[PDB]
Amino acid sequence: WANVENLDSFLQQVYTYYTGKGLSCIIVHRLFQILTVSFVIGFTTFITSPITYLVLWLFLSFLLALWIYYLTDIPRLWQMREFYIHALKIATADMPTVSWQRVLYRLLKLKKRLDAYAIANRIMRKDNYFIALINNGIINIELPLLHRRILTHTTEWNINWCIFNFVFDEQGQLRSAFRNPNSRKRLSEELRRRFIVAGFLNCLFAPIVAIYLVIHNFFRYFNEYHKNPGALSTRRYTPLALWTFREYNELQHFFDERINDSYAAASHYVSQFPDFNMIRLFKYISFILGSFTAILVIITVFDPSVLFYLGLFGSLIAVSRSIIPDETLVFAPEKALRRVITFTHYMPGWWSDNMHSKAVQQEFCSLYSYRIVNLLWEILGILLTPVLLFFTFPSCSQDIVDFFREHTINVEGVGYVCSYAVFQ
Amino acid sequence: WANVENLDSFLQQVYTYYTGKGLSCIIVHRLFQILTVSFVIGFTTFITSPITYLVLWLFLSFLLALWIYYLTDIPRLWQMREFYIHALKIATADMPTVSWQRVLYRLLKLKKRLDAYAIANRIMRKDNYFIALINNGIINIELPLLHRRILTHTTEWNINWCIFNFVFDEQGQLRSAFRNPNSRKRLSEELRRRFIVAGFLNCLFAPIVAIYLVIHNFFRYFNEYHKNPGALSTRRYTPLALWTFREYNELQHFFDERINDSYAAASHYVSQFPDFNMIRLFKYISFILGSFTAILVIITVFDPSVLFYLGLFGSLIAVSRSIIPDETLVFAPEKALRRVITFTHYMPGWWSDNMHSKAVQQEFCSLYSYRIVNLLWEILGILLTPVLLFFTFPSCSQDIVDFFREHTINVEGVGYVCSYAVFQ
Amino acid sequence: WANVENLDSFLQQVYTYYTGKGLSCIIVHRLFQILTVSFVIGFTTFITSPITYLVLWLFLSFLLALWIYYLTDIPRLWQMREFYIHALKIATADMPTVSWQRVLYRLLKLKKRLDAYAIANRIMRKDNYFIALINNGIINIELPLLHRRILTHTTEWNINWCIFNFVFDEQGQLRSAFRNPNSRKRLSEELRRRFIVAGFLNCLFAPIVAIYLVIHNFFRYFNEYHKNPGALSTRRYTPLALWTFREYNELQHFFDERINDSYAAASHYVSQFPDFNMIRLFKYISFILGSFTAILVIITVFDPSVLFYLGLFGSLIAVSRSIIPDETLVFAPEKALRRVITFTHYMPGWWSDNMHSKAVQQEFCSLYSYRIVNLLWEILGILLTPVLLFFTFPSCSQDIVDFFREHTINVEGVGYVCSYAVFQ
Ligand SMILES: CCCCCCCCCCC(CCCCCCCCCC)(CO[C@H]1O[C@@H](CO)[C@H](O[C@@H]2O[C@@H](CO)[C@H](O)[C@@H](O)[C@@H]2O)[C@@H](O)[C@@H]1O)CO[C@H]1O[C@@H](CO)[C@H](O[C@@H]2O[C@@H](CO)[C@H](O)[C@@H](O)[C@@H]2O)[C@@H](O)[C@H]1O
Ligand SMILES: CCCCCCCCCCC(CCCCCCCCCC)(CO[C@H]1O[C@@H](CO)[C@H](O[C@@H]2O[C@@H](CO)[C@H](O)[C@@H](O)[C@@H]2O)[C@@H](O)[C@@H]1O)CO[C@H]1O[C@@H](CO)[C@H](O[C@@H]2O[C@@H](CO)[C@H](O)[C@@H](O)[C@@H]2O)[C@@H](O)[C@H]1O
Ligand SMILES: CCCCCCCCCCC(CCCCCCCCCC)(CO[C@H]1O[C@@H](CO)[C@H](O[C@@H]2O[C@@H](CO)[C@H](O)[C@@H](O)[C@@H]2O)[C@@H](O)[C@@H]1O)CO[C@H]1O[C@@H](CO)[C@H](O[C@@H]2O[C@@H](CO)[C@H](O)[C@@H](O)[C@@H]2O)[C@@H](O)[C@H]1O
Ligand SMILES: CCCCCCCCCCC(CCCCCCCCCC)(CO[C@H]1O[C@@H](CO)[C@H](O[C@@H]2O[C@@H](CO)[C@H](O)[C@@H](O)[C@@H]2O)[C@@H](O)[C@@H]1O)CO[C@H]1O[C@@H](CO)[C@H](O[C@@H]2O[C@@H](CO)[C@H](O)[C@@H](O)[C@@H]2O)[C@@H](O)[C@H]1O
Ligand SMILES: CCCCCCCCCCC(CCCCCCCCCC)(CO[C@H]1O[C@@H](CO)[C@H](O[C@@H]2O[C@@H](CO)[C@H](O)[C@@H](O)[C@@H]2O)[C@@H](O)[C@@H]1O)CO[C@H]1O[C@@H](CO)[C@H](O[C@@H]2O[C@@H](CO)[C@H](O)[C@@H](O)[C@@H]2O)[C@@H](O)[C@H]1O
Ligand SMILES: CCCCCCCCCCC(CCCCCCCCCC)(CO[C@H]1O[C@@H](CO)[C@H](O[C@@H]2O[C@@H](CO)[C@H](O)[C@@H](O)[C@@H]2O)[C@@H](O)[C@@H]1O)CO[C@H]1O[C@@H](CO)[C@H](O[C@@H]2O[C@@H](CO)[C@H](O)[C@@H](O)[C@@H]2O)[C@@H](O)[C@H]1O
Q: So which stretches are on the Cytoplasmic side (chains A, B, C)?
């Protein structure tokens, strides 16, 4: 590896081999991914059975492209596995459980600079620019009519292809033409001619991706969402909430740990806002039905459709007892919210006034939505991303170019990084 | 509010509007309260159907008095809601979740002194005297024959009407005649002529209140206590335990929070005292029945009323497994008790010797009783309070007067407070 | 002050009015400064008494220029005094003792951003670039032949006139042409044509400044350095040591406090390196002379030029006792050095190996020199600065330009600051 001369991509591959947990796990996951896609395709073309033949040929050609890419990438995985076993001296059996600090320790042992912070800046060199574009509103992801900021996975794929393939070298570093203030008019017009091409390609590949996605999600979740409604209120952070919470140089797996360790706190928080005027009503109704049931039971022990009424009242009382919280339950929304914020690290300025508020809870529930709503939006966004790539993104092209010139700072030994990554 | 000149009652109304959680919640609770009373009355007069007409007229006249009082009080609630929205700038939607410290912050912003501690001393000016009368034995609430200290809700209503209406101004402050040591013989005899009148009124309104209370509690709890015995061992603090734990100037909702946050610790503590000589016996019996069942099952797999015996033994073994605790369970009564005391703040002097003891647990279970026992005593105390108001309270009248003269201290900017409130 | 539009210079004037401690103290100091200069001139032209008339006319013309400038600047001082009394509400009697945090508090009360850190970045906007040029070797201040880094006060005056008058606006901010990478060849050649002009002016004003300086220092220090040699070993930090210790955005008076609070630690540290092979010799010599003196005193009490020998031996023994340290004295150079570094905040990388070392002490004594050596070098540097401005500075001109383009970062609300000021 002494002849890399492309240290950024090498470190990124080291990291994605770590988070993939070795060649075995990576190959297994990719295999089951293409198997799931192919099963969806085959089962959908079976239960429904010219135009059908042509669209099936299209789908299977995409599947074969995926397969061919995976087969092409296998050798790079082997090179990295060899680098892990031999150079890093990390056992193939230690992969699913070794930490990133241990890999960093071995990597510093093996060998301008390779500090932990430097390696984080080199792995996340483009992700930091993405965090800074999204969080600072440099790029407008708000729909023109629906008035909503949506960040699907196709949105960020298109952002990474239009911008970060155009702004960064093949060697993976900010091109020279993006700090020259005189070229700000040529680049800011060769960038709209990329947004337009990506919008054209998405207007062709977005229907046949949203269709596959809705079919896959239906097949996967129909069983649970019609035979287990308890798992219908499972809440998760929206994909835009996961880029609002992200910090700079915070590698993906650290972020995943500290976000998964926050769902307990968030589920607790969103429950600290009961409806007392409704709890009181249901307490009253439970009292009435309990009086009726007491009379009925005390009269049936002396005269053995009163059983229908007894069953109905038992059902209604069991319904009511679920709404009525425990007596010895202390509701404290502000400390629940602070317990959440110790994980999400995200407290807007105007929260600090009223963290007990209900408006704060409305906002946090805009960030922490239902999983089914997240699915509906991850399907509608694949359709509405061409709207962005045609109407809101070109108008924001100039700014983007300027953002890469103003807010780029040279950190010695790393290179040109985002200027926001060096503050926080 | 610049023309109040009755700051104590104004602050008390601010506080009870806070703890009632706004005009909406207060009105809803009062409405469902009169609805529950009226439903009990109507259903009891229905399932049972002169004397009946007369007693029904009496009950409905009391109900109408309650209704008329609530309708009379509504305008004061509106005045306070206006003061909350306009002057305090607390949103009507922030009421169920705003804290008392936020209300104090707004109230100090708006405007002798209005510190947090001063407002607590003005809201709890009579409650501090009550805590000091009850905890220091100035007033004797021990029954003459049953030899038990009972503090029902009617007991404290009678104490607040006999004493605190006679001792405190209409403006809500210690009358002047109660610090003059020469009038200690006139006041200590105009106070027995109040205990006697209250005893006479209670000997008339105590039967028709205990009757309503037992009917209400029967209707409410018969369903749960005959169809869910698991909620028969629900333990709660007796009303006298809640005045023993109360601290001075600790507003009601803080006390409620720290008492509700103690039921987990108390339930844990009362379980750290198993019967080892009984656990051993049930372990032996489970072993015997398991041997029998093993033989029976191993003999029925070769010869398919042995099923009756198998079912009976399964039932008995399931019974036995519930008593036998887990093996890896560590019983530690002293640290459980300390975990409780960190909430109740109540450790008598003689506990500090043996907090591992069983006598300490007997006392704490006198404080932390069963809810059904609490109901039986809250019904028997409504009957036995005239005994107090006739025989034990007059004999303790003199002391009471002296208590208000000796143990009153003038805190500057607040007024005459209890001398115990300023120590702890 | 709402119409300033030159916030940087306004804040710098606020700060220099604070550190000057009011109009009274500023005027008094300037007055005694011109009085000291004029006294030196008059006394030197008196004790020595064409060429004399001409050089005296030159000196007095410089004095009159200084006087005229002070008289010109008085009105700005009055404007700032009014701003301090009226707007800031800081009493004229509170000036010599008010802190900078109190001035910051008042200034934030009065009114893109005016945080403490922002005001520090605006006051020290050019000083941060100076710290970064000097500490990072962007500019070469090492003499070509003597091989020594000298930073006189004239050196930094010339740096501030050649560079910071050319690089920064009249409004006080980095000119636009210094971030355009295409103009790096025009600016890097209009900067050598400034170093050359400054070298020419210094080759004319350096003799008649070094002469005045040596005369002033002779007059001031001859008395103390010939009639009090105890104040000849007074050590101070060299002017280059005071730019090596300086941190970014550390205002001048904070730096002065933490450097003055370090001279005790430095004086302690430089004494932890005694010469044991010399202490032993002087102990032996003191023993010999004490034996001789004991014999002489015990023989003169029986036979009253032995007195000459007794006096000489007393003198030599008094000399020896000064070198020999106390017995109960514990020498610990490493913790003395750490006590120093807690103030200077300056520990090179190669110190961390051997902080007990003698080479570390040699380096620290290169930083912490004798005051008389500092005077000799502050006089020789005024002569040798044209050498820098002619031979070492032009060769380093290009780099300087690049330094202002590479290492400039835009902090929002402040402006273009040095990129090193935002790290540490
Ligand atoms: C005719 C078929 C049409 C569509 C086919 C299927 C859709 C496309 C799938 C392909 C592909 C993009 C890349 C292709 C690049 C190959 C080059 C192509 C040829 C170029 C010549 C999907 O990538 C995205 O697909 C999205 C759906 O399309 C998913 O959205 C979801 O929607 C809802 C669903 O439940 C969800 O609720 C919602 O939460 C999602 O937002 C995303 O989750 C996913 O990231 C695969 O790449 C990626 O897949 C993901 C796991 O998916 C892998 O994540 C992790 O990997 C390990 C960490 O390294 C971890 O250890 C591992 O734990 C983890 O899995 C990635 O590593 C990577 O492998
Ligand atoms: C009709 C056939 C359907 C075919 C659909 C397209 C098939 C091609 C997909 C291939 C392709 C898009 C590229 C070409 C797209 C051109 C326009 C596409 C328009 C559609 C016509 C998607 O593939 C990527 O998708 C990403 C999203 O899941 C995954 O990131 C996961 O996220 C976490 C989840 O939370 C997981 O936890 C984590 O383990 C994964 O990292 C990747 O693992 C995956 O490889 C590969 O490019 C990718 O390069 C890299 C940056 O160089 C970017 O990957 C990530 O970005 C950050 C995000 O988080 C991550 O921080 C960072 O880790 C990573 O850098 C992507 O931006 C993407 O650009
Ligand atoms: C012909 C009918 C005969 C009897 C009728 C019903 C009995 C009397 C009910 C009337 C009334 C006294 C005041 C009357 C003043 C009006 C003036 C009258 C006209 C004057 C011209 C009951 O007051 C007491 O009644 C006792 C029973 O009698 C209860 O004992 C119980 O027994 C067992 C039961 O389950 C229990 O197990 C046991 O734990 C109890 O000890 C007590 O809990 C209760 O305090 C109503 O006042 C009070 O009610 C209570 C909630 O009850 C309100 O508490 C809170 O309010 C909010 C904080 O501000 C909170 O936010 C809210 O959460 C909370 O609710 C108070 O605010 C206040 O409203
Ligand atoms: C045949 C028809 C049946 C009619 C029965 C009587 C109907 C009249 C009841 C009306 C009346 C009694 C007054 C007249 C009684 C005369 C003799 C009665 C003999 C019966 C013939 C009861 O009404 C009160 O009862 C209290 C008890 O629940 C409630 O306090 C709740 O406690 C917590 C629970 O734990 C809750 O959490 C909390 O939210 C509530 O505060 C009050 O909310 C309620 O208003 C109103 O007067 C009341 O004034 C105030 C102090 O000026 C006192 O209230 C409280 O005291 C402290 C205790 O804790 C509290 O610290 C303090 O907050 C408050 O100051 C009472 O002492 C009482 O005197
Ligand atoms: C024909 C005569 C030839 C020469 C004349 C005399 C030499 C020049 C003197 C003028 C002048 C430069 C500025 C002129 C600007 C006016 C505009 C001109 C007209 C433009 C149209 C000297 O400035 C420098 O002069 C150097 C010598 O030249 C000194 O070097 C010394 O050498 C050895 C000596 O002992 C030393 O050992 C060695 O340690 C030094 O390095 C430096 O100490 C001094 O900084 C005055 O400016 C500055 O003086 C200094 C105190 O001097 C003031 O420092 C502080 O002020 C307060 C904090 O705000 C503090 O509260 C106050 O405590 C403190 O005092 C500054 O505020 C400022 O006022
Ligand atoms: C034949 C007649 C002799 C006439 C000789 C020249 C007379 C002119 C002198 C006037 C002039 C030089 C300007 C023109 C020079 C052109 C070329 C000169 C060639 C000579 C032919 C010197 O005047 C300054 O000299 C400084 C040095 O003492 C003083 O700083 C003191 O340092 C501490 C000590 O340790 C004291 O503690 C502290 O209180 C003082 O701040 C200043 O107080 C003083 O005003 C005024 O310009 C000045 O502007 C400012 C930055 O805008 C700079 O001041 C400081 O720089 C940092 C340093 O530390 C400081 O951090 C910072 O506080 C301040 O910003 C200077 O760089 C200088 O440029």
A: 69-201, 227-276, 324-371
